[PDB]
């Protein structure tokens, strides 16, 4: 595939190239600063490390945990090199656009989001150090409920148009690009990803409620456990996580009637190779 290079290794003696991450240079000499693969995109020459923390990018869809409540802002753990920030003016307040900036709601920030709360958000922009600035203004963004959290390496999250998907068994998955994953009971909002809907959208007056759906059947819970286990199974096999691979993992896992069985090594490997084989044969 690509040229494998190690730190201090000469990549090229040519000075024409622009120099991206993973490289440093002396005059025309360009050296690698990491162990990884040489990447040439247009005039940009860089070296991509085999391993590394999630590096937030503008427009990314992530799941994060509130780490700190501060001055007009939140500090959110995304799993990157630095805590991301969530400006007070970068979130939706309970209601329509109408409410103007208040000092009171600044004093009751903890009522909207507090230390420990999980939320789904978007990377609006980046600071100079590379840390992310977040926003949750879309109706699909907000505090997460009715489910369980799990995580995988961010590199294993293959990307697409969407990262919120409806899965059989009535379970919605939220695949954060940072590897943070939320598995929830499918809501009416989630149901409405076709193509009284307005009342439905307004019904989520509470987007900072800490209470779950009082009715979560045992079926949905078992299915949550199974999805979690098979996602972890794909992670163990170092298989890229996609929606189709997740539902295929689920269905292939249905062989084992007890979800617990999915935590053993050979079962994980079996599910993985089943998916890969099925993919190659189709």
């Amino acid at each position: 595939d690509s040229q494998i290079v190690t730190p201090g290794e000469l990549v090229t003696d040519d000075p024409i190239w622009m120099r991206g991450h993973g490289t440093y240079f002396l005059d025309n000499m360009t050296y690698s600063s990491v162990a990884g693969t040489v990447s040439r995109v247009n005039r940009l020459l860089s070296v991509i490390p085999l391993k590394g923390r999630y590096a937030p990018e503008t427009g990314d869809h992530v799941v994060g945990r509130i780490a700190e409540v501060g001055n007009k802002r939140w500090k959110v753990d995304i799993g990157g090199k630095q805590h991301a920030v969530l400006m007070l003016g970068s979130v939706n307040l309970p209601g329509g656009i109408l409410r103007r900036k208040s000092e009171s709601d600044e004093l009751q920030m903890r009522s909207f989001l507090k230390e420990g709360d999980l939320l789904n958000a978007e990377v609006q922009s980046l600071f100079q150090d590379g840390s992310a600035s977040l926003h949750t203004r879309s109706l699909k963004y907000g505090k997460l409920r009715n489910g369980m959290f799990c995580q995988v390496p961010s590199s294993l999250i293959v990307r697409a148009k969407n990262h919120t998907h409806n899965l059989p068994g009535n379970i919605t998955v939220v695949l954060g690009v940072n590897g943070y994953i939320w598995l929830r009971k499918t809501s009416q909002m989630d149901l409405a990803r076709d193509t009284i809907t307005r009342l439905e959208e307004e019904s989520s007056w509470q987007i900072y409620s800490d209470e779950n759906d009082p009715s979560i059947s045992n079926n949905i819970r078992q299915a949550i456990c199974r999805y979690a286990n098979v996602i972890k199974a794909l992670a163990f096999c170092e298989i890229g996580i996609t929606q189709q691979r997740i539902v295929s993992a689920y269905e292939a896992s249905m062989v084992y009637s007890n979800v617990g069985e999915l935590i053993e090594k050979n079962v994980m490997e079996s599910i993985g190779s089943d998916i890969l084989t099925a993919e190659k044969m189709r």
Partner: protein, 123 residues
């Protein structure tokens, strides 16, 4: 944060620490200018002995070297016991060489571990 646990010790432990740090830092994907290879050289009378063990470290003076990449430049130079000045340079000469070999070893592992985990991740 670098967290090191010395499970077993048999002399020349400083260079070992250095090598471990280099390996682990490279594994983390953390950018650096080059390898740093750590080695130790004892001086028995006139002759220098490369990569001394515990018994050799006793009843002998040792020099620890932290060498940058394939260069002749030293990141670390440690002498904790008395050594004749006129024979110090010689001790460095083999040391550097030894360190280079050590680099070649660490490198040799990384590439393999790279080559393995960049091919299997494919498809």
């Amino acid at each position: 944060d670098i967290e090191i646990h010395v499970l077993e010790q048999d002399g020349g432990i400083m260079g070992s620490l250095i090598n471990g740090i280099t390996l682990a830092l490279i594994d983390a994907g953390i950018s650096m200018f080059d390898y740093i290879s750590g080695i130790s050289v004892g001086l028995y009378d006139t002759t220098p002995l490369l990569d001394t063990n515990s018994l050799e470290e006793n009843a002998m003076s040792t020099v620890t070297l932290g060498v940058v990449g394939k260069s002749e430049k030293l990141s670390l130079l440690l002498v904790e016991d008395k050594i004749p000045l006129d024979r110090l340079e010689n001790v460095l000469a083999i040391g550097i060489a030894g360190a280079h070999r050590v680099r070649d070893l660490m490198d040799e592992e990384l590439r393999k571990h790279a080559q393995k985990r960049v091919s299997n991740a494919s498809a």
